[PDB]
């Protein structure tokens, strides 16, 4: 029971990819439309999400085997999983102490209330926080966190995927890497893997609810005009 | 030779409209994506222009007779004239002393160089400055400035206009008001009116060049993604 010189290369890649597309100082946030605490946080959070999508795309492109999919599959996967990858990667800034995402100073500490100022219900936010708390409680190794993001992105059960035999293959190889990594490198991690797969299940429902909330926003031009072309294109139903 | 109780009501309306849609403190600019001095000013200037378009729409809706046009005509006029109304209204912030638009502090003082950081050529900017200098030299009364904006918007010679017999009527009434106002209220203004109409001619060419520059930008997704949904819709060729 020892990782193969191919399983660790996959791990090397995903971890470097994450480092290349995730800044722990959050210094680009000053370039977003500033936060205001009628849907005052919408501009800021739309910018955040748009930016994060760009980052998720950069990451996805570095997932072993992703570049080889058809552009359609790459798109079909990004569109379906974008919000979930975003929810996953945000855990890095999320804080149990204050139950908010802490991206620096008074301005970039996002709490439940801030997101409601962006067209979301206090009600719909409960699960997201709960999910962040459960995910944070797992205390994932960077290897696992980064692996979980890649596995999520390569879910075959996404509307629009064509070659779902091949995405299933890439994801299984990834799942294997993670199971092996946990068994070999993660003491006390006997039941961790399954808790992680459970998280993917939680992501699907969170994705579902968001999609609904987002439709409501995107249908009112006064609100939709606050979005970005990227956000509108990624969360839009335009089908190709 | 004395203005009619109807010509002054038109003047009252356009002047109040301008006051309602133009802030001389420029305090909303802090809500734009901040300026950076690869096309670093694009985000800021796109936000500025998007905001200004919103303001131009607010103004247009208060131009006597504009609300009565078909929604198509209103749109056809806004789309064609938007950039020109913007160029006209900016003269208020433009400064002969420094040949820049001065909207407050180091951050919001826009010079020729800043606009080039937004995908425009130093070459294409020459006329805009020249135009601002000529327009500023006219030292227009607020009544005239505001009148000139309304006349520009109701130009009948715009792609897409349907009822160009009726826009011509509204614009002529406006032109009359301005000619009368100048004759009666503007000492030393014998030759001013014609210089103002000449400015409309200058706007057409400036509109033309911008449209070209804008096409170049809007065709590169990496640049187009920096625009706003409003800008993209107003300067887009989508035809209806």
């Amino acid at each position: 029971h020892m990782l193969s010189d191919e399983q660790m290369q996959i791990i090397n890649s995903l971890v470097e990819a994450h480092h290349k597309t995730y800044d722990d100082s959050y210094s680009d946030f000053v370039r977003f439309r500033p936060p205001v605490r009628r849907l005052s946080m919408l501009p800021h959070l739309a910018d955040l999400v748009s930016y994060s999508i760009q980052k998720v795309i950069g990451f996805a492109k570095m997932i072993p085997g992703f570049r080889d999919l058809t552009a359609e599959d790459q798109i079909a996967l990004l569109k379906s999983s974008a919000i979930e990858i975003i929810m996953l990667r945000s855990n890095q800034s999320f804080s149990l102490e204050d139950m908010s995402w802490s991206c620096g100073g008074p301005d970039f500490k996002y709490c439940i209330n801030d997101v409601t100022k962006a067209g979301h219900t206090l009600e719909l936010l409960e699960p997201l926080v709960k999910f962040q708390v459960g995910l944070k409680k797992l205390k994932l190794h960077e290897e696992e966190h980064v692996l979980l993001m890649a596995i999520c992105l390569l879910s075959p059960d996404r509307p629009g995927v064509q070659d779902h035999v091949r995405i299933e293959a890439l994801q299984d190889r990834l799942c294997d890497v993670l199971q092996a990594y946990i068994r070999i490198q993660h003491p006390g991690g006997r039941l961790l893997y399954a808790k992680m797969i459970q998280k993917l299940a939680d992501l699907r429902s969170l994705n579902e609810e968001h999609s609904k909330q987002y439709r409501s926003l995107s249908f009112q031009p006064e609100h939709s005009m606050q979005l970005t072309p990227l956000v509108l294109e990624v969360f839009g139903s335009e089908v190709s | 030779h004395m203005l009619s109780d109807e010509q002054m009501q038109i003047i009252n309306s356009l002047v109040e409209a301008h006051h309602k849609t133009y802030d001389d403190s420029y305090s909303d600019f802090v809500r734009f994506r901040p300026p950076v001095r690869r096309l670093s000013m694009l985000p800021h200037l796109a936000d500025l222009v998007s905001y200004s378009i919103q303001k131009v729409i607010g103004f247009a809706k208060m131009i006597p007779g504009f609300r009565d046009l078909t929604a198509e005509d209103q749109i056809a006029l806004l789309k064609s004239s938007a950039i020109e109304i913007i160029m006209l209204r900016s003269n208020q912030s433009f400064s002969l002393e420094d040949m820049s638009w001065s909207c407050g502090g180091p951050d919001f003082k826009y010079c020729i160089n800043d606009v080039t950081k937004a995908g425009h050529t130093l070459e294409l900017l020459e006329p805009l400055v020249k135009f601002q200098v000529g327009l500023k030299k006219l030292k227009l009364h607020e009544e005239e400035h505001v009148l000139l904006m309304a006349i520009c918007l109701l130009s009948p010679d715009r792609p897409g206009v349907q009822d160009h017999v009726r826009i011509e009527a509204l614009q002529d009434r406006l032109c009359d008001v301005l000619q009368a106002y100048i004759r009666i209220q503007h000492p030393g203004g014998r030759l001013l009116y014609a210089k103002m109409i000449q400015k409309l001619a200058d706007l057409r060419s400036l509109n033309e060049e911008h449209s070209k520059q804008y096409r170049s930008l809007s065709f590169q997704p990496e640049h187009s993604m920096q625009l706003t949904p409003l800008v993209l819709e107003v300067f887009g060729s989508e035809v209806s």
Binding site: I57, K61, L230 | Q220
Partner: peptide, 10 residues
Amino acid sequence: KHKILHRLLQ
């Protein structure tokens, strides 16, 4: 048509 996504995907 996904102009931007296709662009960003290199």
